[PDB]
């Protein structure tokens, strides 16, 4: 069908714009060094860069988390036109309802980033649509030390601010700016939650 | 090929940090591989000399002391025929257990060994932890060869080690006579009768 | 030998679309560095290098996990495996090997197509101040040292600024050693 | 079937050591009596194999038997060695020893990005002489899960 | 099975015999065999000391070498010690006697029954050692094997093997 490249380099790219976010905020320009052709580049790596956010001043962390949804915003509002050229039938730009574009996104975006549907969707009829997936793809492979499970959720909480930006981008492709929050919401058998506004 | 006649093994023993390996690596020609010390423990370099028109390979095995190789190094003194306790004159606590190394090496080495005693790092001549006359005396009532073993610009080792292979050579150079093979006759046309 | 085994790994690997993703992702995280610095361009190369380093150092263990390869030593073998079963496995493309040095050292890595600068047009203020695909020098410098070599990589030219090809002139400077497992007794 | 499982890094450190009959998975009391002399065994035999290897592709250790047990190795090209001490009456475990590298270590350590990919703790007392470990929660669970049918 | 190099090391480390026959080249031949032989004695010592919480050796007669040297199943003498290395190019067997005299056989035929065919050859080299080097008044103890009868008494048996 389409030309394809491998998922394991993309998922590992997708895991680490948060060290890129603290390396863009903290480095406005124990840290290490390397060289190139009569130069140097000062390096700091990911284990010693997400752990500067467990010791983050509160305006610094909230300054970082705008950038993660800004990345998600740019990739979402660039992704929506190519998914329109995929198929995207039977919906409009002003789009007086909301469930027909929540049927769009779980079948049509989240398959093209993660390969499956958002398998639950709950309908508050005044416009708060709950999108629940059970096993989220990039957080399949993260764990803390020997039963220190309390201090890792608050450690790993920047990593869900990419699908804030995705659903901001695919709705600013259809008109406007909205309000978004995230949850964790564990399963019932062998979680994540997003609103709409 | 190989073509040497005898092969002796000579341990270098002492405390750690007394300076045995730097004493070794000037002195043997080389061992062709730097390898490492502390993977199997003890490392080993060769040295070939000749005595009395016999050619000798001597294999120096210097032993590390990291407290892990407890049964291992005691298995490595099995069959050891030549020995050298090294001590440094700067530090002083090595001499408290030089006698400990001596009574561990009189144990389970051979029936009879020839133990030398060598004072490394004589270059820092202004830091003598123990007097040389006391160690000279302690060598005298223990039948041991004693050398200054000064560090740098020295040959103390190039005469003392040759003298150690001499004394260990006549401990095992027993006897031989000749391999001339010149007795030839009897080229006939064989009028045999059985 | 290799190119059969490269397609053999292209029959049991997880895939997704290279258009409409991943050019979007890399272009979005270079647009952020364009706007984050605030429209300066000789600094984004020295952040994309320092990000590609960290993404290459973890990629190399996945690449040795997929195909069972020994530690490469000469630049015949690294230049063969980079053109045949690293870029073919990870990015579906293959380069070609020209501009070979004296004494088997420094070669070039002309890329035919490029699924990082694919369908990108670069604005006029960065004709002489930006390298676009300079996460690739990050993955090569941070990936070839992890098989205990030591290298140096740099772009020479690019299709976006210049009609000549995208090529990386990788230089062997030295080969690192293995270290002996204590200082001393 | 399996007595012990060990990892060794490029910088000469044991980082994981599961010893069975429900013993320690940690280097509390069974450390230093066989860890950095098991590493010395495999390093000396790996050193004498490369001097004795004709051909172009030099080889590495596949198994070292004794009269009682066996040592099995898988020395990856990035300097990361899977050694494994087993029983008799079954052949080479090289398929299991690359299954661990292709489905547990790269799944849960190198693609974990909270933890370091272990090369050092970034000092010059990391050459052999420093200690650290991995202890990722999901790693230990599936690694004790998979080896458990091989009693 | 097959043998490409006989190495005979002492009871005190360094070797007393080796012949790398059918090399079809000139290999490296100096003190690197001495440091190899001492390295094998050291790792034979080390492989005693590590043993996990566990806390056999009955060969047969396969008629190797063509009357032969023995008839009956026997025992070995080393349990906590190195017995067989296995790699891609070669495979190294080793055999300790009771007195402490290890015999090392490097094998260029790779990939448990190789133990059974191996030690029935490495005891038949031990019988030639005890028959043709022990009754030798020019041969002192603890000295390289400079006898020239021992070479073409074992060459015939190994070319009778392979």
Tab-separated table of N, CA, C and O in Angstrom, chain E residues 48-86:
chain	number	residue	atom	x	y	z
E	48	UNK	N	36.733	-24.430	40.024
E	48	UNK	CA	36.393	-25.115	41.259
E	48	UNK	C	35.518	-24.248	42.147
E	48	UNK	O	34.469	-24.691	42.622
E	49	UNK	N	35.940	-23.004	42.378
E	49	UNK	CA	35.476	-22.261	43.539
E	49	UNK	C	34.072	-21.700	43.373
E	49	UNK	O	33.357	-21.554	44.368
E	50	UNK	N	33.643	-21.382	42.157
E	50	UNK	CA	32.256	-20.997	41.959
E	50	UNK	C	31.496	-22.257	41.594
E	50	UNK	O	31.879	-22.974	40.663
E	51	UNK	N	30.470	-22.547	42.354
E	51	UNK	CA	29.557	-23.652	42.121
E	51	UNK	C	28.271	-23.252	42.828
E	51	UNK	O	28.314	-22.827	43.988
E	52	UNK	N	27.126	-23.338	42.176
E	52	UNK	CA	25.884	-22.891	42.818
E	52	UNK	C	25.343	-23.896	43.821
E	52	UNK	O	25.985	-24.909	44.112
E	53	UNK	N	24.144	-23.649	44.356
E	53	UNK	CA	23.588	-24.466	45.436
E	53	UNK	C	22.998	-25.786	44.928
E	53	UNK	O	21.806	-26.060	45.055
E	54	UNK	N	23.865	-26.610	44.338
E	54	UNK	CA	23.561	-27.998	44.032
E	54	UNK	C	24.089	-28.918	45.123
E	54	UNK	O	23.302	-29.592	45.796
E	55	UNK	N	25.423	-28.929	45.295
E	55	UNK	CA	26.152	-29.551	46.413
E	55	UNK	C	25.894	-31.057	46.515
E	55	UNK	O	25.848	-31.625	47.607
E	56	UNK	N	28.101	-40.230	37.725
E	56	UNK	CA	28.427	-39.859	36.361
E	56	UNK	C	29.847	-40.291	35.973
E	56	UNK	O	30.503	-41.055	36.691
E	57	UNK	N	30.289	-39.799	34.803
E	57	UNK	CA	31.631	-39.963	34.215
E	57	UNK	C	31.964	-41.434	33.977
E	57	UNK	O	32.960	-41.964	34.465
E	58	UNK	N	31.091	-42.093	33.225
E	58	UNK	CA	31.261	-43.508	32.911
E	58	UNK	C	31.404	-43.641	31.400
E	58	UNK	O	30.399	-43.702	30.678
E	59	UNK	N	32.625	-43.667	30.875
E	59	UNK	CA	32.824	-43.896	29.439
E	59	UNK	C	32.709	-45.358	29.034
E	59	UNK	O	32.220	-46.187	29.803
E	60	UNK	N	33.123	-45.683	27.815
E	60	UNK	CA	33.008	-47.038	27.286
E	60	UNK	C	34.219	-47.310	26.389
E	60	UNK	O	35.186	-46.547	26.379
E	61	UNK	N	34.186	-48.417	25.651
E	61	UNK	CA	35.229	-48.749	24.683
E	61	UNK	C	34.670	-48.530	23.273
E	61	UNK	O	33.750	-49.254	22.858
E	62	UNK	N	35.125	-47.512	22.545
E	62	UNK	CA	34.679	-47.312	21.156
E	62	UNK	C	35.628	-47.810	20.073
E	62	UNK	O	35.323	-47.573	18.897
E	63	UNK	N	36.740	-48.457	20.451
E	63	UNK	CA	37.818	-48.934	19.568
E	63	UNK	C	38.413	-47.778	18.755
E	63	UNK	O	38.248	-47.662	17.541
E	64	UNK	N	39.074	-46.886	19.482
E	64	UNK	CA	39.796	-45.773	18.881
E	64	UNK	C	41.228	-46.205	18.609
E	64	UNK	O	41.922	-46.701	19.504
E	65	UNK	N	41.665	-46.037	17.367
E	65	UNK	CA	43.036	-46.293	16.976
E	65	UNK	C	43.211	-47.617	16.268
E	65	UNK	O	43.424	-48.650	16.907
E	66	UNK	N	43.175	-47.554	14.936
E	66	UNK	CA	43.395	-48.657	14.004
E	66	UNK	C	43.447	-48.031	12.619
E	66	UNK	O	42.530	-47.309	12.222
E	67	UNK	N	44.740	-55.190	18.901
E	67	UNK	CA	44.557	-54.992	20.332
E	67	UNK	C	44.619	-53.507	20.691
E	67	UNK	O	45.356	-52.743	20.071
E	68	UNK	N	43.842	-53.106	21.695
E	68	UNK	CA	43.870	-51.730	22.175
E	68	UNK	C	44.180	-51.682	23.664
E	68	UNK	O	44.567	-52.692	24.256
E	69	UNK	N	44.011	-50.520	24.282
E	69	UNK	CA	44.677	-50.266	25.552
E	69	UNK	C	43.865	-50.684	26.768
E	69	UNK	O	44.459	-51.056	27.783
E	70	UNK	N	42.536	-50.644	26.704
E	70	UNK	CA	41.714	-51.019	27.850
E	70	UNK	C	40.358	-51.493	27.352
E	70	UNK	O	40.007	-51.306	26.185
E	71	UNK	N	39.557	-52.036	28.275
E	71	UNK	CA	38.348	-52.771	27.920
E	71	UNK	C	37.094	-52.277	28.634
E	71	UNK	O	35.981	-52.457	28.130
E	72	UNK	N	37.251	-51.646	29.790
E	72	UNK	CA	36.114	-51.550	30.686
E	72	UNK	C	35.784	-50.087	30.974
E	72	UNK	O	36.661	-49.224	30.866
E	73	UNK	N	34.506	-49.773	31.242
E	73	UNK	CA	34.139	-48.454	31.766
E	73	UNK	C	34.847	-48.111	33.065
E	73	UNK	O	35.096	-48.967	33.913
E	74	UNK	N	35.160	-46.830	33.203
E	74	UNK	CA	35.996	-46.337	34.289
E	74	UNK	C	35.388	-45.032	34.785
E	74	UNK	O	34.250	-44.684	34.450
E	75	UNK	N	36.142	-44.297	35.589
E	75	UNK	CA	35.657	-43.072	36.194
E	75	UNK	C	36.555	-41.922	35.789
E	75	UNK	O	37.596	-42.112	35.160
E	76	UNK	N	36.139	-40.715	36.141
E	76	UNK	CA	37.028	-39.577	36.040
E	76	UNK	C	37.510	-39.187	37.434
E	76	UNK	O	37.290	-39.899	38.417
E	77	UNK	N	38.190	-38.049	37.523
E	77	UNK	CA	38.798	-37.630	38.769
E	77	UNK	C	38.560	-36.169	39.110
E	77	UNK	O	38.830	-35.784	40.250
E	78	UNK	N	38.074	-35.343	38.188
E	78	UNK	CA	37.783	-33.945	38.478
E	78	UNK	C	36.295	-33.676	38.306
E	78	UNK	O	35.700	-34.042	37.287
E	79	UNK	N	35.693	-33.068	39.317
E	79	UNK	CA	34.306	-32.638	39.234
E	79	UNK	C	34.180	-31.131	39.344
E	79	UNK	O	33.547	-30.504	38.489
E	80	UNK	N	34.779	-30.525	40.364
E	80	UNK	CA	34.825	-29.070	40.478
E	80	UNK	C	36.042	-28.577	39.704
E	80	UNK	O	37.087	-28.253	40.261
E	81	UNK	N	35.897	-28.532	38.389
E	81	UNK	CA	36.988	-28.105	37.540
E	81	UNK	C	36.555	-28.124	36.091
E	81	UNK	O	35.598	-28.808	35.718
E	82	UNK	N	37.292	-27.359	35.288
E	82	UNK	CA	36.958	-27.123	33.889
E	82	UNK	C	37.119	-28.395	33.072
E	82	UNK	O	38.037	-29.180	33.292
E	83	UNK	N	36.215	-28.609	32.157
E	83	UNK	CA	36.230	-29.895	31.479
E	83	UNK	C	36.210	-29.757	29.968
E	83	UNK	O	36.884	-30.524	29.283
E	84	UNK	N	35.480	-28.783	29.436
E	84	UNK	CA	35.320	-28.650	27.993
E	84	UNK	C	34.871	-27.240	27.677
E	84	UNK	O	33.830	-26.803	28.165
E	85	UNK	N	35.644	-26.538	26.870
E	85	UNK	CA	35.245	-25.270	26.292
E	85	UNK	C	34.657	-25.510	24.910
E	85	UNK	O	35.078	-26.414	24.188
E	86	UNK	N	33.710	-24.658	24.525
E	86	UNK	CA	33.023	-24.820	23.249
E	86	UNK	C	32.860	-23.471	22.564
E	86	UNK	O	32.229	-22.572	23.120
